DNA sequence: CCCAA
DNA sequence: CCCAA
């Protein structure tokens, strides 16, 4: 059924930031499963507790772009989701138009390991086709990036994109107001911006973002949207320039605007992907299948070659992802006389890059890791730098990669990350059990400060010392023991 | 008294966006005299009406920056905006440390036309005598901006910045709290943001900047904050890096970032101002004085020649305002024999550029305007360009040159500007009594809309068609009765 | 002196 | 195929 479908995408796949295609932006040790539909309804029905705070702040975790800018995704608390996710599967008639939006690409759809928004689940035979079929004829492309879609989306404008503004000014009960409520109530009753990472967000954003969508539409734009960014495939120029006022005015109307620094018009014929990305493939040693194993088994010299003049790339154009893309493109097809000098190559970019941390789970295994201890102090100086910097991915991709691994970490290094204190990483810590007593003191000072969203912002570490009897529920409402009662585990065992 | 010239700097000269130093962002047409904190007392008395809606909305005016990026300053409501000052004057002892921050160079200070504050008051003697001692002995400069000072302002950090972040969180009455509280009902009750253009928001956002001034302070850094842009001065490149971090820190206390995309290290000895700056300044015809005022007269090759060169940097360079800068070098030292060739050359830039309009206003009185009508169609298609890029700075200044200099208006550019609906230009149409049926229509709109919001979003159109007795007031309270029975004006007469 | 932050 | 939006 697409509607359970959407409940378990919601609630035990999507729940927490887990879009990505082939590595998630969080370890596969953290995962939304065990919470079940059935739990988030009892939730929701709990009516029980007394908060001084109005809404519910979320679990922060600030990944890495590939140019080292974080992005906060969060995980929203499991009440506030609960409401929100039942609220929205309840009404997935009225809102399931937005799966036949043909302009968005990156949208609910029914897939097999059971979410509803994988970014770029389409194969390159669909995307080739489609960019050439949109591209022929036309000689101008219009890049044009929504400025604030996730951090200043206007709560208040989901009824505006459903049943029109002025309509929902008159009318001021329909779904779209209590929907409008709950993505409140999911961060702390603000009317501003969605919390990234969750399907619940992006659902509210392609309802958002589908009014604009049918208006570009039936002015017989061709146009594809990717969440915020907009491509145009335009005759002439000043079909470019209509585009883009016709597109501010429909964003406008929403309270949104287009970011003026990305905004971009290009002569077609540019390139199907962006031009780094084909200089990439161009030169990759990998680039041709044999269809024999050993054939295609990449020497020393041509991994470390072609990571340099990624290096290369990456510092010269650094128009995207380029060190991912090519780390990709090289890491499964390594012999094992190459596995030393490229996991090096690997430790030195995921110092500098922290987006490169989770390529180092690839090669963890070949590695011996015992050694002389010289990958133990760079596994933490790796996590000083996730430290010092701020950044949640690299940090908990580390932690779980020497937990996993048993590479031991210093007391000083376990300083900086109380510190900086990281709920996910901290989750880590208090999984592994070795720091019950910084934990316990860390959570002693979120209690007696007394304010309800610090106890939300670390409400996965509370939950989680609950679960195992570690310490008691901070709330005083029956969510947490709702969750625990059935089993909930967002640490679970394999 | 400091308290006095605060009130009356907060009401009468400081409500509406009046900071900027020679040319106004709004026509002078428009003033914020003659209302005294006495009527803002008895506003903040009145507690009469009932609003649906919590909070109070804005005007908002779109003025361009020099890149036509539109910038959104704000007219408060004069509800929440004489609670707010009022609120911020019977605090002004526990609020005036803002006062004696001396790395903040933009902030509240006793003015001699009235106000408080004043973007670039500072003359270039000290200026560049403050530049030269903090630069000196040290090789690198740090540009930091902050992404969202004025548009994700946390308005429940204002308590922790005065008593610290803990204490505050702790204690939850102290002023700083009902500080926040009138801040959010400036903006519809909403917690993030304040508006530009009034010194309330800059007061309030100079008192959250300050505590991190102290930080930055304290550890013994030399720096300069303007608004949301910090310059420090650092002696090695490690210096920088820390003073990075460090205000990364204390701005993440606050919920505050700084722009990524903006921040940059650069090696001293750079230039005092902008290297755009010294290319004008070496190539300014009028650079050097004769003091006979016959030979300081430019010719026209000089200045025409001068504003090409001054297209081409703007074009090459662009790190500023150019074109600004480079016209008002060269508006004053005309002669009338080069009037025409000027004005045409601004009237040109100015369609290009909306923020060159003002200057139309220098010569606006030796251009003979009559003529054949083509300055009248010049001047229509200027307001055709405003009402298309939706720009409220250039038609609201267009609109004054037409009304003051008898320029006629058709109708099909009214109606463009009852299509775009800029409140400013809309108080400027209905002044003029010309077109008093499409404003009534307009307002009958937004009465029928029953949107409290869309109200306060024209509340100066409907407060000057109240205090004219066109129309009846369109809120149930008595603050547009107390305005209009003190003979509140923001429209007055010479 | 003449901009902007 | 292998990124990101």
Redesign the pocket.
Known sequence: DEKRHLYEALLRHNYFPNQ???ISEIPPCFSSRTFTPEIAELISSDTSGRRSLQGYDCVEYYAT??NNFP?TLSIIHPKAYSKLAKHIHDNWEEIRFIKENENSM?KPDMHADGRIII??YED?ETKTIRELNDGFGRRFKVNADISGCFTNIYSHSIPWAVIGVNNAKIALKHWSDKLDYFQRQAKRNETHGVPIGPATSSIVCEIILSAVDKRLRDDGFLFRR????YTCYCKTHDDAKEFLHLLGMELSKYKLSLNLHKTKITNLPGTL??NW?SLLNVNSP?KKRFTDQDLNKLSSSEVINFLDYAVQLNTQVGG??IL??AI??VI?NLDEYTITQVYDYLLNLSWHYP?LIPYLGVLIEHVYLDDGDEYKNKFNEILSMCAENKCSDGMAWTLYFCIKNNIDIDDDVIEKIICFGDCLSLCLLDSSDIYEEKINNFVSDIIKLDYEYDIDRYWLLFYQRFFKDKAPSPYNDKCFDIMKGYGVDFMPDE
């Open positions: 990505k295609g082939s772009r590939y992005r990156i970014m770029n390159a990717y969440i915020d960014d992907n962006d990305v990998t995207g992802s991912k893309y990709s493109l499964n987006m």
